[PDB]
Ligand binder design. Structure first.
Ligand SMILES: NC(=O)[C@H]1CCC(=O)N(c2ccccc2)C1
Ligand SMILES: [Zn+2]
Length: 139
């Protein structure tokens, strides 16, 4: 689990979105596993605006943060789960690391701010849904 809180927005994994997230929907993209809902309280997370390929992510199944090198956002084949059939997920970044289903929502951060959230895993890889291209989150 986990979310990003920036301005009047909440960013979550689309497959973990709640009834309240869907009742206050701003934007969702199934191909990216992202959903953004509106909030009444102001969030103070900072989104990174950069092309970093190194950062640190939180892994709840280890209660640890790990430093990782990750690929640039791209279209990557993702195995089927209970939430989606096997498909290409877009705007996904991969790194070598640990990720279980419950790790989704953990934040990946660089020196500039939040880069994305854990969205995929298995086979010793961890995949993060990028949020750096969503410039509107800042206004
Ligand atoms: N983005 C996705 O398609 C998610 C769907 C649900 C799910 O549990 N995914 C997953 C995450 C970590 C390890 C193993 C699988 C992938
Ligand atoms: Zn950066």
């Amino acid at each position: 689990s986990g979310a990003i809180y920036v301005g009047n927005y909440r960013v979550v994994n689309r497959h973990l979105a709640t009834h309240n997230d869907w009742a206050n929907l701003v934007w969702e993209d199934s191909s990216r596993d992202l959903l953004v809902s509106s909030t009444t309280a102001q969030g103070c997370d900072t989104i990174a605006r950069c092309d970093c390929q190194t950062g640190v992510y939180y892994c709840s199944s280890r209660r640890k943060h790990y430093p990782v090198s990750f690929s640039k956002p791209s279209l990557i084949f993702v195995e089927a789960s209970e939430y989606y059939p096997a498909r290409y997920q877009s705007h996904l970044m991969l790194a070598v690391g640990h990720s279980e289903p419950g790790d989704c929502g953990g934040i990946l951060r660089c020196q500039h701010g939040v880069v994305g959230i854990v969205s995929t895993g298995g086979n010793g890889l961890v995949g993060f849904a990028d949020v750096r291209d969503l410039l509107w989150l800042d206004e």
